[PDB]
Design a protein around this ligand. Sequence first.
Ligand code: AUV
Ligand code: CL
Length: 242
Amino acid sequence: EWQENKSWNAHFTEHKSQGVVVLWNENKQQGFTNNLKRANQAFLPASTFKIPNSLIALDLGVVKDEHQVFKWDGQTRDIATWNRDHNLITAMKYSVVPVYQEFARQIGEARMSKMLHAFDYGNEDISGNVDSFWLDGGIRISATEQISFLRKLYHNKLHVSERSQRIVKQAMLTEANGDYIIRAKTGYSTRIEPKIGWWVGWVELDDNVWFFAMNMDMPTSDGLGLRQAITKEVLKQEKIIP
Ligand SMILES: O=C(O)c1cccc(-c2ccccc2O)c1
Ligand SMILES: [Cl-]
């Protein structure tokens, strides 16, 4: 069911890094990784939490739809794309933390906790501040646990409405061409050691879906582009994409 290929470590070590890639073949129900231990080690989800956070906000009516505008609060932040109005689509695309912090405040501790347990999401622990627990609180999730959660979402099996799941999968759209579609979300965790980057999602092909979840050491922001680049190079090596 699970195969470990330590030779794939070269994708990380050739960049003076270390990490894990996890792939799941939905048709064959088989998994692949370079490191079974790290595949099951739990990290802060950071901005990959925008997937469950969006689902909860939509299902509770905190967010009406993907067109509702979340007005910039007029506080100048150091990420230029955050200093503007957003909807769910662009908020996901630009990982706009302050918009999702307000989502969490309106969701509230009790409903957030209950929904994460319903999702079987990571350690389901929201200890910390309700508006930042996914950045510096107690919640943790592994690469394999991300795959499990994403598979439920793909099949509309999460305990929210079909509509909420369709909207979030629309907002996850990252790349599409004549050969494949990628729906995914990046993450960048810096507040608690070790600093890492995430990329989790899936690749849609004509007759199969390949789920993926990766994290990697990220001592500085200079390496953030390696999250997607390394993953796609693994996918290309395994003949999942051209
Ligand atoms: O991963 C991104 O594409 C992304 C999106 C938004 C912000 C940042 C970021 C980069 C450096 C330091 C802090 C950040 O919050 C990174
Ligand atoms: Cl779509």
